[PDB]
Write a protein that binds this ligand. Sequence first.
Ligand SMILES: Nc1nc2c(ncn2[C@@H]2O[C@H](COP(=O)(O)OP(=O)(O)O)[C@@H](O)[C@H]2O)c(=O)[nH]1
Lengths: 158, 420, 454
Amino acid sequence: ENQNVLKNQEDTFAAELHRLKQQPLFSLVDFEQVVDRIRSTVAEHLWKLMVEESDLLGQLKIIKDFYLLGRGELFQAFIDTAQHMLKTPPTAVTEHDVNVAFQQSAHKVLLDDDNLLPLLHLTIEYHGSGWAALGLSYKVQWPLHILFTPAVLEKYNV
Amino acid sequence: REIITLQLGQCGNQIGFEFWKQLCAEHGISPEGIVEEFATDRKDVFFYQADDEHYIPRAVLLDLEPRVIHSILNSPYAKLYNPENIYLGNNWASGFSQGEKIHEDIFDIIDREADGSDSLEGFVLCHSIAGGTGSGLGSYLLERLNDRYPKKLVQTYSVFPNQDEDVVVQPYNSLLTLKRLTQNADCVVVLDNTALNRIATDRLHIQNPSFSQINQLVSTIMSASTTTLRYPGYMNNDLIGLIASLIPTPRLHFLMTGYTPLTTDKTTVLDVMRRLLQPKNVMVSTNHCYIAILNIIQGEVDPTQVHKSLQRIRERKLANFIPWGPASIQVALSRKSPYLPSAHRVSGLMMANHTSISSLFERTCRQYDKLRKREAFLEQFRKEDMFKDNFDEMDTSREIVQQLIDEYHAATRPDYISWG
Amino acid sequence: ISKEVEDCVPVFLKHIAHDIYVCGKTINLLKLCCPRHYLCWSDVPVPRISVEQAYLAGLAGQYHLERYPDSYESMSEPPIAHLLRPVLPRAFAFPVDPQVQSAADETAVQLSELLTLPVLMKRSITAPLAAHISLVNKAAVDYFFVELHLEAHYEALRHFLLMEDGEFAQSLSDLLFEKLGAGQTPGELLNPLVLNSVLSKALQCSLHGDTPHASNLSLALKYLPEVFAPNAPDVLSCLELRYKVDWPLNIVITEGCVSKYSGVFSFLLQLKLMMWALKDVCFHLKRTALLSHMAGSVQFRQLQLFKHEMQHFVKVIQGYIANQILHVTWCEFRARLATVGDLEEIQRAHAEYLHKAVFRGLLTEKAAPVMNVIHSIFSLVLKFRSQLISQAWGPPGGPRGAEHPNFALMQQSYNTFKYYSHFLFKVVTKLVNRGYQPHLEDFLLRINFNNYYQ
Ligand SMILES: Nc1nc2c(ncn2[C@@H]2O[C@H](COP(=O)(O)OP(=O)(O)O)[C@@H](O)[C@H]2O)c(=O)[nH]1
């Protein structure tokens, strides 16, 4: 509804609910019938938009491709190039050092295309064996925000 | 200031004829010299402006005992170049002596144009090394110009000749030309007959008519080397700014050439830049390293690509260089013209100071050293002996070019801070 | 948007609180300016009240050149005017169709449970206003753009004030530089006559062109110099290029906005200033030309190189700013300029065409440190190169450092410049790691393309 700056069955449904009001005694089945008629119409319309306008199949390919080590050549190389930096203990400035290494690893595979990289970064935490604090994070578009609340990515992080 | 091109010798006159023709079609010009009707560029430097838009090139055409020379005159473009300034042996000494008697009338033809122009910044010579008449006459005219016109900066589009080694005195003639060129050229751009012949064999099946087809190759490089000057830009508009970066020490003023489209007949900048660093696209034939590199790309290039592109070539390190000079490759961009085809609209060229070119100089010095001992071709022609009885200019040239051969390798070393 | 803090969510919804305000001021402005065929006050129709081989090759080139005007017909397609009118009767008739059903259905909605939908649904009745709003914005854009050829004003301001045109920038700065360094140092170069004379001379000699656009170009000054300083730095010389703006675009281009445009002219000029002397010192070595080639001096060779190293750093700095602003941000602004569809939208594209150019300039206050090192570096280059010019060569024999005997002092200077260079190598990085300055990644990338240091 907001973020605008969708089919108008509101009346039809208003007529549906209006009729429901007129009925003398509560009949759960009719209420259930009309509510799910609407529920069904919103989910179907909602599914089409996100699935096609913002293809999710690709988004998932990316999530497994990185959070789930679906990219073997790159991850292996990233471990190879930054072996010592990640091995040494954590502090405030090691964070950029790993990322430039992870970007350096990205061109090291040489399999690259426009963007792709902008939506990922490495996140080290110090004062609360650097390999111990290495966390991967993704930038989600608004439509997919509900599907990917931080909690699901938080479990994915482990 | 306007540039005056002193095209001389049959070979030199052939590549000036074509270079001006190449800028005829590329610019809004016609064979008569008038502008075409269908025709935002800076034509002031290269083309004089006549009252009725007859943009006549400031070409100085020098000929000696002309016979095939008359062929330039029987052309549709005879009217296009009409400063009405053309004035009448295979030995370097034979060419130098002929130039000395006619020096004042050829030099007045230089003056006329200098007076006619609002200003004169440089003399660009379509020189032929070991060019029979072209060499010797070209060395002498190279010496007179600096004395008279010290303020101006000279360039030489030297077509250094390598044909797999006919001229039996070719090394002797070339040896003498370089001593003068090193001494009396502010800049030199080197090209190689074999390197281009190898390119001709690569891109095309043309082998026997190597000279006619290779003329187009030398031309594409020549038009391209000045396209930033010919078309408006935010930087290096003046010739001098461009020249400074390419030549960091005065002695090492020889420049290597390459074209990203070996065949120009979309592509991202990250790609076009990488091609210049492949040796198949280069047109020239102990550690060795470039002294400083520059590149100019043409067309509606996407710019963001270049930051990625410049940082990208860096990781690739396809170009290996650690000279005394800092040597960052420099990125330039220009507009492809609105008359000629947009096929391969993006197309690039690179001009670089490389210590490898020292090897080409040493090979003619090797042929000469071998030839000097034998004295097989001292010519001993009375012109050659009477002009040079001591034959010590060849030895003076040998030490000067050896100093150059030495200086180059000193550049490779970590201490060019010390004298080279 | 709210009367005081008492906003009427019932009527405005706070949504048209702002839109109503905008449409009112734009129609009143266009109409105020003059009746235009599309609107022309109440001329709008029935808006429902609601509420030779070379020559044949030349012909192929002529067709390729003529293709660009055929593509440029699309640029000139929007101010049709005669077709704009047909859209309107259709355009306002189209609302009538919802307005036709709505009244009857308003009877049905009124009949159904007083209101079948929530009380807030009454916002449907006021919705048609948007239609008028769309027409208002689109119309304004054409007058503001094609009719007033605004892009050309931005294009020229970029050309002359940001010095995009190469020839114009070098000449205006060139004449002034000869005088500034030469003498007249007590503001004798601030004669209003010389200033105007050079400006007209610069504009005429640029060769990019003489145009109605060249008008409104002014050479001016703000702060008054007591005298120019040593090295004639004009390090902040207050020479303000002033650009007049016409009444309608006076609203589009705000005084503060052109106040920012001036800043680049300043730094760019100083870069040019740095550039000038160096070309000249090489020209001065070429002035000596070792004219006594009979004598080849070893020290000469050494200095011949010190000039190049200092020259190499300044060429990179002038290059870094250029790509960052001259082709990396105007392209972005042009895409935004094509996209902007309303007065407020137009104000923010030019706003960031410059808030960004300034950020990439490094003149931004948070980025003061790098600019500070530059000042030290730029100061050394100016003053020390001036010294070699002051002295003259000496007798020709053996090793001859005494030619310009002050050479010894300059070597000490050569090391000071280098010290700053190494420091700058360390400074850019010091800042990049602490926060995110993606722009500075480009800075350092170039400064040390090949080594810990060159
Ligand atoms: N690039 C190029 N070089 C040529 C051409 N014709 C001759 N040459 C070169 O010219 C040199 C000899 O010069 P020459 O033609 O004898 O000058 P001449 O004495 O006036 O005849 C040789 O080294 C050739 O490589 C040509 O069409 N293109």
